[PDB]
Amino acid sequence: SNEYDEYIANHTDPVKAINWNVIPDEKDLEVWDRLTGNFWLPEKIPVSNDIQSWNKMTPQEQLATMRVFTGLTLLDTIQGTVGAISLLPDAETMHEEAVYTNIAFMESVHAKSYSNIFMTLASTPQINEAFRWSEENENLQRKAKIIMSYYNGDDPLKKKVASTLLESFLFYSGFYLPMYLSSRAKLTNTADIIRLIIRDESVHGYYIGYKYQQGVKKLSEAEQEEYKAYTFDLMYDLYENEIEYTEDIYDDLGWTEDVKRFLRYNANKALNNLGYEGLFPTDETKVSPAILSSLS
């Protein structure tokens, strides 16, 4: 009766209902239609049909798979419960806020999809060892905490930069494995789930980056230069850390050199989403056409 009187006295402007009949930025509606039109749940893909394929894989291949998927789960958990949500208060339109709520939910769907895969293919000990490894891996924890330091900060623009780098770059050291296996006719149903996830992340990265550019272009030329400097500096740090993460996961298998090229290819895409030129020359980003297609 009184507890809320102060709040009411300090918020005299009307609270407004979202009006979808009036859209000041057409992009918000285009992305909302795209994302909602692409709704899916992991229960829709028959992962159990990969059991034979999975049992045929070597212990090294299985271990690499558990670790990359656990790393991916951690990134989705962060993005869904902390990332997308941190973007809400800095939205330019109410329709953009609505889009972020869809992004948050689909991230939770993504994270859950990995457990569906594990629960269908792996043993309890394997699952347990995997989650423990993710808590102890220094590089995985470092990339997670670097991104979270920005979501927990007070610069709306840095939150969008961190979010775009996460969505367009950090997931890729992990996405290489299922896409490559898929090109060898292995774990094909699991790859279908991975493609649905990529189809979402691609749009998330594109959209959040678009919003970053709109905000940064409102600043002076000098300020804009500082944000670009910050973006590239953050990319150098994430790349350095991802290289070590990659070596540790893929050295046994011997896939490391190709995964590093894949990292550089996507790092360029991530920068492009933020409106900047790529960092690595094209000749250093070669990706197998069998991966690029099964990726799409």
Applying CB under 8 A, the residues found at the interface with a second copy are 1-4, 7-8, 11, 14-21, 32, 36, 39, 41, 70-71, 73-74, 77-78, 80-81, 84-85, 88, 94, 97-98, 101-102, 104-105, 107-109, 111-112, 115-116, 118-119, 124, 127, 131, 134-136, 141-142, 144-146, 148-150, 152, 233, 237
Minimum CB distance to a second copy, residue 89 (Å): 9
185 binds, among a second copy, Mn ion, none (CB under 5 to 8 A by kind): none
> Which residues contact residue 283 at a Cβ distance below 8 angstroms, ignoring those fewer than 6 apart?
none
Residue 58 binds which of a second copy, Mn ion, none (CB < 5-8 A, kind-dependent): none
**Rounded-to-integer distance, Cα 18 and Cα 271, Å:** 32
DSSP 49: G
Neighbour count for residue 17 (Cβ, 10 Å):
6
List the binding residues: 76, 107, 110, 167, 201, 204, 244, 247
Q: Which CB sits closer to a second copy, 5 or 221?
A: 5
Please report how close the Cβ of residue 105 comes to Mn ion at its closest, in angstroms: 11
Catalytic residue (choose from 114, 151, 212, 227) = 114
Burial 97-118 (b: 16+ CB within 10 A, else e): bbbbebbbebbebbbbbbebbb
- Greatest Cα pair distance, the chain, in angstroms, is 68
| Cα radius of gyration (the chain) | 20
Nearest to 205 by CA among 179, 236, 172: 172
Q: Which does 201 bind (CB under 5 to 8 A by kind): a second copy, Mn ion, none?
A: Mn ion
Q: Catalytic site residues?
A: 114
